[PDB]
Amino acid sequence: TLGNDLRVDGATVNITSVNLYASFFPMSHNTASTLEAMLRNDTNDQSFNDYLSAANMLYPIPPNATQLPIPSRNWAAFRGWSLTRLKQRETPALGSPFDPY
Amino acid sequence: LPSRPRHGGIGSRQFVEEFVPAVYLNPYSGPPDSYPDQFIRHYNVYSNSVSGY
Amino acid sequence: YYNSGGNLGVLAGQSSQLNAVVDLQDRNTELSYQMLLANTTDRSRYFSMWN
Amino acid sequence: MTFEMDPINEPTLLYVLFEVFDVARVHQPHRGVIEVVYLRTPFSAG
């Protein structure tokens, strides 16, 4: 609830074991093989789309005034903007495994 | 000559001669029994079904 | 580790060791999943299988 | 884009996400080989 850092407070986490579980639907072998053969075809490929399909760009803001982003490109099939303000202290640096700051 | 004319499997030469790549134009359209079977690796024609472990 | 750098997960099959997972560091899959849950399910009800 | 916003003392950072078409297509031809194609049309990836 408080914005304290836990590295200084000395919390730490120890992982004992990691296991992967999966659930298999027990569908008949003949029907499952038929479905596998049908889905292995190049015309029946599965398609997925990221829900927040966007390019996230975070532009730092000095604690006043305005700002101006972005150079050139082709903007084909663009779908829109979604601006929001974030505090730099709260936002980490996901581009690295560890954020010392 | 052999006593019987060796009925059975197919050699590599005849296999590559005859089992040419197949072009399946409209893929898997119709009733399940109309599908091209034997595209499945584990499938026997006799008693049509998929052989498991 | 989602959309990270060196810590990239792989789903590559044993065939060609070609990873089926690519991350761009410009995509926010955590926020995408949060929005997906908030739009599909009534998130006001707490669930314990996942937090 | 020129953004004007109320000033706050703490250093902050803007969160602009350009809505694109992030889509992936998965092809599984033969028993354990998986080929996946990605496409991001406004902001190309590869």
Partner: peptide
């Protein structure tokens, strides 16, 4: 077969779903 053997039979007619029901589109940034 007809693929009606894979669906629940509400009496005699199968409880088939819509022909165009397959497919989905759920994507918005906000």
């Amino acid at each position: 077969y007809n693929y009606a053997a894979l669906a629940p039979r509400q009496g005699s007619r199968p409880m088939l779903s819509q022909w165009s029901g397959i497919g989905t589109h759920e994507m918005h940034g906000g």
